[PDB]
Structure formats: C-alpha cells, structure tokens
Amino acid sequence: MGLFVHEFFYSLLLFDLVYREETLLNVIKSVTRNGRPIILTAALALILVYLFSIVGYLFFKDDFILEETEQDKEHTCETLLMCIVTVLSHGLRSGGGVGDVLRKPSKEEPLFAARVIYDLLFFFMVIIIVLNLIFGVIIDTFADLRSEKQKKEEILKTTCFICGLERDKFDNKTVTFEEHIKEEHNMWHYLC
Amino acid sequence: ETEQDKEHTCETLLMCIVTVLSHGLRSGG
Amino acid sequence: GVGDVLRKPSKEEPLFAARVIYDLLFFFMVIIIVLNLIFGVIIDTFADLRSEKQKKEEILKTTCFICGLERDKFDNKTVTFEEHIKEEHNMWHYLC
Amino acid sequence: VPSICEFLTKESKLRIYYTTERDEQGSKINDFFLRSEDLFNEMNWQKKLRAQPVLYWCARNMSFWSSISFNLAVLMNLLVAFFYPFKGVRGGTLALIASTILRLIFSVGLQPTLFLLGAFNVCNKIIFLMSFVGNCGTFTRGYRAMVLDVEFLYHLLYLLICAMGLFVHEFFYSLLLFDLVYREETLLNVIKSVTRNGRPIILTAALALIL
Amino acid sequence: ETEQDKEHTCETLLMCIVTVLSHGLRSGG
Lengths: 192, 29, 96, 211, 29
What we know:
This is part of a larger assembly, with five copies of chain A.
Chain A: H1 10-19, H2 22-29, H3 40-48, H4 50-59, H5 84-91, H6 109-158, H7 168-173, H8 180-183, H9 187-191
Family (chain D): Belongs to the InsP3 receptor family.
Protein name (chain D): Inositol 1,4,5-trisphosphate-gated calcium channel ITPR1
Binding site for ATP (chain D): 10, 13
C-alpha cells in the first residue's frame, strides 16, 4: 500500500511496528487475557441501559425537537419506535450527565420530579456503577498481571534450578555455596 | 396554551433546593 | 463525548446510524479503554510502590541484622533475647 | 572505642538504616563495608572542620537555615501574583523568630519590603550554600557519583532563582516555590508513583495517540 | 441600573489569572 498504492497505510505499518514493542505489548495485555469473555461484559451495561430506555419511553415520549441546497433543515426528529435504540448513545453522550434530552420542562414540577429522578438514577447507575465496573476488569488485569509475574520470577531469580528449596539457609550454613550454580543445576550444561 | 414551552419561571423557593442538586451534580465536568 | 463534531444530521437516519455507531465506538474505545488504560500504569505504580516497600522494611524492622532468620521462635525459646541487638548485630558497633 | 568515633551525628545513623542492596539472599554486608569506608573519610574531615569556628556556627543552624529560606522565599513568590505593582493600592481585601520577621515586613514599603525580600533571598540562598558546604567540604571523594552532583546542582538552581528577582523580571518566584515543595519527599514518594515504571510508559501514551 | 446582567466586561488584567484557573479546570471534559 505504497508500492504504487494509495496514500495512507503507511500508518498501518507504524501501528504494527510499535506493537512489536513488547513492554507496550505487556500493557496491551493488561487488556486481552482476562478480556476474551470480558468483551461480553460490555454488553452488560449495553443491556442494563437498554431497558431504561423503555422505562422512560413509555411514560415519556422523547419530546425532542432540537439540540434543496444544504443538509440543514428544521430538525424533524423524534424517535417513533426505532430511534430509541439509537439515542442511547447520545443518551450516554457524556460522562457528564446522561439522559437529559428534554430541556424546558416548564415547571410542571411534578413531571419535573419524575423526570429528574429517573434520569438521575440512570445517571447514577449507568455512569458509575457500570463505568467503574467496565474498568474494573481492566484494572484487576494489572493487579493480576504483575501478581503472578514476580512469582514466575521467584522461581528463577530467587530460587535456582531443581531443588524445590528456598535455598539460602542451607547455603549460608555450608561449604561455599556461591558456585553451586556453575555445576549442580547448570541447565546449559544439561543441554550440553 | 399550545406548547409546553414558556418563559422559564423557575427559582427554587425552599423546596427545589433538594431537587436542583442532581442538576447541581449534573456533570462530572 | 468524543467525535461528535457534526450536528444537524437531518434525519438522513441511515447516515445517522453509520455516523453514530462509528463515533460511539471511538467513544467507547477511546475513552475508556484507553483512559482506564493510561491510568492503569499509574495505578499499578502505587500497587507496586508499597508492595515492595514493606518487604524492604521487613528486613530491618521485622527481622534484624545478619541472621537470614525470622528471629522470634528462637528468641522466645531462649536466654534473654531482647538485648541481642546491642551486641551481636550492632552494625554501628561494626563501624566502630 | 577510639576517641574519634563519637563525633558522628544522627545523619549517619539513618542513612545506614536505608542503604539496602539485596543482591541475593538477604540485604547483608558488602553494603556495610562500602558505607563504612566512606564514613571514615567523612569522619576525619569533621575534625578538620574544628580548626574553623564559623562552619561550626553554621552547623547547628543548617537544616533550619535551608528551611527558613525556603519558607521565606515563597511567602515571597506567591507574593508577585498576589499583588502585582504599578498601581497605588491599599491592603486590598477585595517558630518564634519567623513570625517576628513576617510582622516587620508587613509594614513594608508597600514596595520597599518587596525589594527587601529579594535582597534576603539572595543572601538566604547563600546561607543554604554554606550549610551544604558545612555538611560536605573539600569535595571529598566518595563512591556515590550520582549524589554529589545532584545535590550541588539543585542548590545551584536555587541560587539561580535568586537571579530571576535580583533585578530580573516578575515571575519565577513561582519556580522556586515549585522546587521547594518538590524537596518534599513524601510528595516526592507520590510523585514517584508516576516516573519509575514511567520511563518507557510515556511511550504508552502514544498507543492511544496512534490508536 | 436595574439588573445584574451587562455586556460582560471581563478580561483579566493581572489578578484574574489566579481566578480563571478554576474555570480553566471547569470541566473534566
């Protein structure tokens, strides 16, 4: 895709070269290993939002109007029974405040109360609970990821080859212990 | 009246204080 | 909310669908995944940072100088153990 | 004991508690030996200091000398912003010794006091340099090649703050405040909670910047 | 005057710099 082939891509090659970098690969891992059924934990919220569309939409139709030459007309929206599944993304539009599509409630304050409470709750639930929830697995990733790893480097750096023994007591106590790794456990020598 | 859209006669005498906190906490911004 | 530069899509709702889906996905990916990702290393920092550190204070506060020994069993069992740190392991005294 | 080993005050006792070096099994001895020989060299020179009294006068001052300057200095830098000059303005509602000094400045020149603050800061940083020298003098060789350089360079930078208000323009004062708070450790520990596993993880930023 | 709503005569000579940071840091957005 640049032999004689069109613009771009070059970008693709850059992305994979940096992927070939490992360490970043380790942090990249901090998102796939406990992730392979945890792409499925995304749809948890995508369904746990999905009902409270209706719970609003029944008692409250969206009542939404605004947020040839040109593509700019008098904004003929409002969501018959399809766009409900669309507007959730612009429902979840912000990390600031969710729902919140109708403005000018015009102080029919009871209706005011109902509406706010309901949106708040989605706000609350949707935003936080699921958002620290989505991460969560992203951050017990890295809580796991090192937590095994020094134990994997326990068995080479801390303890040596085949003893099943934590080494040191025995080593200070006798002979000279330092050079044990040259002969009695020298894996390279086993291969030799 | 025709529509539900008037000149916005709000302001919170002593009740709506407990309401507006949610729109106080409106954003994470 | 990320992307989201065009407003007034004017209900050419298919185009509407395409656009939203795409932005959402960036939204999703970009925002969260990478944002809890950026931090992540910021917060396994502090998960690491103490996690070594009490082990570094294991070797002075918990166990004493050169024994490679976790001390206490042996100490309750004999003599009087309390004053061991004045003589047999007194690094200051080694310097002296 | 020998008759020289007593003069080996509390700064040593805690550095030796924190010079770990776990190479293998335990955090034992090679460690002690390195620190010990350097300590002997510092110890003789301490009695070379006895031939000159001014340094000893400074010595009981030193931590406080440095501290005093830093405190004083800022209560200066934020000052610039706090009351930018050229307008004739009122007050604008809009330690035993330290308090006395603050009070005196307070009825200042409503500008003369600002000049005074700059003047003692230059002076004040010179006392920090002197305290630093009191702790380590003759450029006495030592094993730790990172430390000597870093300490003197940071003190030099603090001397440099003195420049950007000697007769030198507004601001900066702010810079000096930022580094004094950096000299605070604990915040330095939390600051660390972002550089050590960060030195190739500034590279993990561009991951998203490419993604 | 009648109301507290004028033609917005702002801009920060050398004081309001230390104010506007909060409305600098206005959002998490």
